[PDB]
Amino acid sequence: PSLQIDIPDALSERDKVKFTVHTKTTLPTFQSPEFSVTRQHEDFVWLHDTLIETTDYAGLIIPPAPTKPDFDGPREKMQKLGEGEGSMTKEEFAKMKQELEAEYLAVFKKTVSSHEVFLQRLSSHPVLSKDRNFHVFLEYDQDLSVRRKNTKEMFGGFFKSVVKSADEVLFTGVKEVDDFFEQEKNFLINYYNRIKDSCVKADKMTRSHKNVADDYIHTAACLHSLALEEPTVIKKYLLKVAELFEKLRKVEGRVSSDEDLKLTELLRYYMLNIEAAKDLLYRRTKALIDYENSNKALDKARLKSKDVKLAEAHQQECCQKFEQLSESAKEELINFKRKRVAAFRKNLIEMSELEIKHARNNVSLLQSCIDLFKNN
């Protein structure tokens, strides 16, 4: 209760999302017990990078950075709808617009949630909740992200990636040493593919759901249009079914969005989280290769008896640096497992509740309409 963080709103400006980060605190390190600041996705990436680069946090499970907000799909569909406004009825256009606004809102809510969960994880951690760059990004001296005018720094960072990317690509062709990092590795290796496959299948399912929802709106339009010219007895009956499909469209689009949030997004998260755990194993074993490199250096140094202590010391630190990474690695992998079980359990529970909510909502909608006609 001493540091509570929520993201009550966000604003999607052109190619950017701004999050209102709201903080409530009883900690005397902050100037106010309640305050709000504006933050962009890049500020969360910077906070995450700074926490990873902090040497004293090397033995802590740093929460994964939130995913970049992707609105390109919903925005492209919204633009194409505006170009097509003259080819359809005002009622069809209004319906299709509402379905796309609901798709956009579902992506927007998943984005806000992922950013809030990242900050809440930092606030819940006994060390990271006291981090100066965290406190500065929350209730510190306003915002200190893009305060420096020069881009020269950005150009230098981009170059590192072209050179940096090669080191990671080269590192893929390596053979595990000793007896550590064995069975578990291929497991993550195996789970990532199963996670990725279940993610694209989930995405296809929800996108088919929205397609079905779109039909409901288009169907209610033709029903309404059809009911115009007709004997009055059936004319009113048809308007009640068009009114029905207008509402059913609203729940189907809603079940697609909640489906995208609880399942597809849960799977997206741990597809990148698995990738992060794999980088931990890569670094741990890197030490191993370093410890071999060091011995081959001592073996020759002892023969000439020149720099024995120097190559001895080198061997000692890569032996035990490996153990230091090995401790923090296992401490974080286990941490990951525990967090993944809680996440799956949480989303599965929530999804089930939402599925039941919408199912009952449709039952009452269809029930009342059926009981209406049976009792004309």
Binding site: P8, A10, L11, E101, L105, F108
Partner: peptide, 20 residues
């Protein structure tokens, strides 16, 4: 060219903001 949407928690509501 500059359609922006505001997402707010009071229950969440999304508002279109139209600025030419």
């Amino acid at each position: 060219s500059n359609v922006s949407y505001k997402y707010s928690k009071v229950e969440w509501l999304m508002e279109e903001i139209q600025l030419p």
